[PDB]
Design a protein around this ligand. Structure first.
Ligand SMILES: O=C1N=CCC(SCc2ccccc2Cl)=N1
Length: 154
């Protein structure tokens, strides 16, 4: 019914790393780094792997910060996205054919050029809160309905 994905935010005291996706689903928007979890891999190992594939960065400990389920009306599969944060990385962000990473000051997060749900949950992430969300979309621009609640255990 739902397929596992990961999303990783590199969030430091004064800045966050986002990646401008160049191709495929969400192309043209800034977001964290993530993708599909593989056969035989834990969700956390998938999150670590996707961060390196998409940003060139190495993370050790990842912290669970959220779960968000996406529904696209007309599409059978739900995306079950496991969201993680880290403040501690190694390497320099690398630009590839798939992704252009840029640091942003926290008061300059480019919400108009991000998926619209991010305006709801990113501010929770900035204040070190944890959350469970559901967003029902029509196409990629319209939130038909949503729920979002803070939790103590992701
Ligand atoms: O921020 C949002 N808002 C709605 C949909 C999405 S899907 C983009 C994505 C791609 C691969 C893995 C995880 C994610 Cl979140 N992201």
């Amino acid at each position: 019914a739902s397929r596992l994905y990961t999303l990783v935010l590199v969030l430091q005291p004064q800045r966050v790393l986002l990646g401008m996706k160049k191709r495929g689903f969400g192309a043209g928007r800034w977001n964290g780094f993530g993708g599909k979890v593989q056969e035989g891999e834990t969700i956390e190992d998938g999150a670590r792997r996707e961060l390196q594939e998409e940003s060139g960065l190495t993370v050790d400990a990842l912290h669970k910060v959220g779960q968000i389920v996406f529904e696209f009306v007309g599409e059978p599969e739900l995306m079950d996205v496991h969201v993680f944060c880290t403040d501690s990385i190694q390497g320099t962000p690398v630009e590839s054919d798939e992704m252009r990473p840029c640091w942003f000051q926290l008061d300059q997060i480019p919400f108009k050029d991000m998926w619209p749900d991010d305006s709801y949950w990113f501010p929770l992430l900035l204040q070190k809160k944890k959350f469970h969300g559901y967003f029902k979309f029509q196409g990629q621009d319209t939130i038909l309905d949503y729920t979002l609640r803070e939790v103590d255990t992701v």
